């Protein structure tokens, strides 16, 4: 081991990667074939599951002060998992019939809150990191993700003409 700047970057990294997929899939969600749906869920499922561990190590990596939301985020994360995979699992069966675009719209909505949530996790605790530094005993961009999230919203409302 060397420094304690390994886990701090790990979580801040995963929180971004997962977002990249959330939007990507939302783009080709329509044309999303039945062969890409199987693995698709596996991708999102990994993000949420990973987030649980990422935050776990974030506790110590950050100064005790923002554990409130972090704690509630743990149990909450689990629920979001079963909830997400649940609805998504339905679309996989309600796609061969005809009502695909329907479940697709709502589907994106769910993943939308998840993507932003996973990111907000580190964003929130971030305020604590500076709280200690800018006071005493000191120790993939924000805007980039913001703009990306915006498009995701519009993509859900409806396709490009």
List, as one string, the DSSP characters of 44-75: HHHHHHHHHHHHHHHHHHS-TTSHHHHHHHHH
Q: What are phi and psi of 61, to 5 degrees?
A: -50, -30
Rounded Cα distance between 68 and 35, Å, is 41
Range of the domain at 78: 1-161
Residues contacting 61, CB < 8 A, separation 6+:
4, 7, 8, 11
Looking up residue 137, the CATH number of its domain turns out to be 1.20.120.330
Q: Are 18 and 51 in contact (CB under 8 A)?
A: yes
Residue located via tokens 């995979």? 85
Q: Are 62 and 4 in contact (CB under 8 A)?
A: no
DSSP reduced 3-state for 59 = helix
Q: Are 113 and 79 in contact (CB under 8 A)?
A: no
Q: Alpha-carbon Rg of the chain, whole angstroms? A: 18
Q: How was this structure determined?
A: NMR
Total structural domains within the chain: 1
């Amino acid at each position: 081991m060397a420094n304690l700047d390994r886990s701090n970057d790990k979580v801040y990294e995963n929180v971004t990667g997962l977002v990249k997929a959330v939007i990507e899939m939302s783009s080709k969600i329509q044309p999303a074939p039945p062969e890409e749906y199987v693995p698709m869920v596996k991708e999102v499922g990994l993000a949420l599951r990973t987030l649980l561990a990422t935050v776990d190590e974030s506790l110590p990596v950050l100064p005790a002060s923002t554990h409130r939301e972090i704690e509630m985020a743990q149990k909450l994360l689990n629920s979001d998992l079963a909830e997400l995979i649940n609805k998504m699992k339905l679309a996989q069966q309600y796609v061969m019939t005809s009502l695909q675009q329907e479940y697709k719209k709502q589907m994106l909505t769910a993943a939308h809150a998840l993507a932003v949530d996973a990111k907000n996790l580190l964003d929130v605790i971030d305020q604590a990191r500076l709280k200690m530094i800018s006071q005493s005993r000191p120790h993939s961009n924000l805007s980039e993700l913001d703009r990306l999230l915006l498009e995701l919203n519009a993509v859900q409302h409806n396709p490009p003409s």
